[PDB]
């Protein structure tokens, strides 16, 4: 019923925080070089 | 409940859909300047 979805919004985000913590890593290795 | 639930998954896979280009355009940025 609802465990299902509160079970996946748990999963997706915790996807979203490891991609968010990714693109702040990569957009910081590429300042680093363009700069 | 079912609905408001069915929603922020829906949110939160756009999100990650986002993401997940977002990574792959600065993983090819970096990896060319490095270049």
Redesign the interface.
């Known amino acids: 019923?609802?465990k299902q979805?509160?079970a996946?919004?748990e999963e997706?985000?915790s996807?979203?925080w490891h991609?968010?913590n990714?693109?702040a890593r990569?957009?910081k290795?590429?300042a680093e070089?363009?700069a | 409940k079912v609905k408001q639930l069915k929603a922020k998954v829906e949110e939160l896979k756009s999100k990650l859909w986002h993401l997940k280009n977002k990574v792959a355009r600065l993983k090819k940025k970096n990896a060319e300047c490095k270049a």
Do not use: A, P
Request: proline content about 0%; hydrophobic content about 40%; overall charge negative.
């Open positions: 019923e609802v979805l509160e996946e919004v997706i985000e996807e979203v991609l968010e990714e693109v990569l957009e290795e590429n070089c363009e």
